[PDB]
Amino acid sequence: MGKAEAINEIQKAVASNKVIVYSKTYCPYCVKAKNALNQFIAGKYTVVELENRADCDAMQDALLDITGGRSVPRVFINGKFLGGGDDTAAAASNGTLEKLLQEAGAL
Ligand code: NA
Ligand code: NA
């Protein structure tokens, strides 16, 4: 369960879920992203919490390789990285989160 495996896992999950958030339970920016998504699709999307993953470091290293940054949250829609918590809240506020969810078939 090293970094190469984590990259594999994340890429497969991102390609196979309309909306997926990599998160940790104690994380106010993760909550900002979740609350933004919950304005449109509460209860319908995947969250992967990382704080009790034995391979949490490899998973966050994999997120860096895939998205450019290591921090949670890391939000993906329709297989494409959206951003973190501020990004997801901004997209909720400006009308684009709804449109991206529609285009993904999640809404
Ligand atoms: Na969904
Ligand atoms: Na966990």
Residue numbers in the entry: 1 to 107
Paper text:
Glutaredoxins (GRXs) are thioredoxin superfamily members exhibiting thiol-disulfide oxidoreductase activity and/or iron-sulfur (Fe-S) cluster binding capacities. CrGRX2 is a class I GRX member that possesses a classical YCPYC signature with two cysteine residues present at positions 27 and 30, whereas a third, non-conserved, cysteine is present at position 56. In conclusion, using the roGFP2 as a model protein substrate, we showed that CrGRX2 catalyzes both protein glutathionylation and deglutathionylation reactions in the presence of GSSG and GSH, respectively. In addition, this work demonstrates that C. reinhardtii GRX2 has the capacity to bind a [2Fe–2S] cluster despite having the canonical CPYC active site signature that was shown to prevent Fe–S cluster binding in some other GRXs.
